[PDB]
């Protein structure tokens, strides 16, 4: 997306639903990588549940 | 047969001096604290720069995050999803990663009720 808009003052707009977990995932999206341990029963991210609730 | 030569490289390796020496030799055929001395030796023939030049160098990028509330249908679907047996799954009851990913996907497609709830005509 940045490559195609390589120059000429490109404008990027992002739509995110308010008061939803989408904002939490946007601000913090590294959880997918932090849990790169063996799949099929990771069972990690205990404290990160606060984002799903809010 | 050429009187001059020009080479383009993205970035060379720090260690493995063999490659650097071979490149310097093939530049011109007239040659037979560690990193500091290596850079000092490569002073006469070197021209490098970093991306710090992009500052005010016509590189103008703009990003605007626009917040948008949910519709009544969206609110209803969200309340329904969060208020379901999945609550226990969200509380890390079993297969935590799987149920979390499933709930995230559901809430993601819930950004438009027409996707999960396809409005259809009321035929008679």
From Swiss-Prot, chain B:
Tissue: Ubiquitously expressed.
Top-level taxonomic group: Eukaryota
Protein localization: Nucleus
Subunit relationships: Component of the NuA4 histone acetyltransferase complex which contains the catalytic subunit KAT5/TIP60 and the subunits EP400, TRRAP/PAF400, BRD8/SMAP, EPC1, DMAP1/DNMAP1, RUVBL1/TIP49, RUVBL2, ING3, actin, ACTL6A/BAF53A, MORF4L1/MRG15, MORF4L2/MRGX, MRGBP, YEATS4/GAS41, VPS72/YL1 and MEAF6. May also participate in the formation of NuA4 related complexes which lack the KAT5/TIP60 catalytic subunit, but which include the SWI/SNF related protein SRCAP. The NuA4 complex interacts with MYC and the adenovirus E1A protein. EP400 interacts with TRRAP, RUVBL1 and RUVBL2.
Family: Belongs to the SNF2/RAD54 helicase family. SWR1 subfamily.
Function: Component of the NuA4 histone acetyltransferase complex which is involved in transcriptional activation of select genes principally by acetylation of nucleosomal histones H4 and H2A. This modification may both alter nucleosome - DNA interactions and promote interaction of the modified histones with other proteins which positively regulate transcription. May be required for transcriptional activation of E2F1 and MYC target genes during cellular proliferation.
Protein name according to UniProt: E1A-binding protein p400
Gene source species: Homo sapiens
Lineage: Eukaryota, Metazoa, Chordata, Craniata, Vertebrata
Gene name of this polypeptide: EP400
Full protein stretch here: 1239 to 1382 of 3159
């Amino acid at each position: 997306c940045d490559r195609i808009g390589r120059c000429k003052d490109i404008h990027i707009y992002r739509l995110v639903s308010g008061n939803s977990i989408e904002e939490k995932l946007l601000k913090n999206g590294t959880k997918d990588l932090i849990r790169e341990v063996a799949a099929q029963g990771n069972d990690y991210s205990m404290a990160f549940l606060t984002q799903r609730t809010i | 047969q050429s009187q001059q030569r020009l080479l383009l490289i993205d970035s060379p390796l720090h260690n493995t001096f063999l490659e650097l020496w071979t490149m310097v030799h093939f530049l011109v055929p007239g040659i037979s604290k560690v990193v500091i001395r290596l850079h000092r030796v490569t002073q006469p023939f070197i021209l490098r720069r970093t991306k710090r030049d992009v500052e005010k160098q016509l590189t103008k990028k703009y990003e605007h995050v626009l917040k948008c509330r949910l519709s009544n249908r969206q609110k209803a679907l969200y309340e329904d999803v969060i208020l379901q047996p999945g609550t226990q799954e969200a509380l890390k009851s079993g297969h935590f990663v799987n149920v979390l990913s499933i709930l995230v996907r559901l809430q993601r497609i819930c950004n438009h009720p027409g996707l999960v709830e396809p409005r259809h005509p009321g035929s008679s």
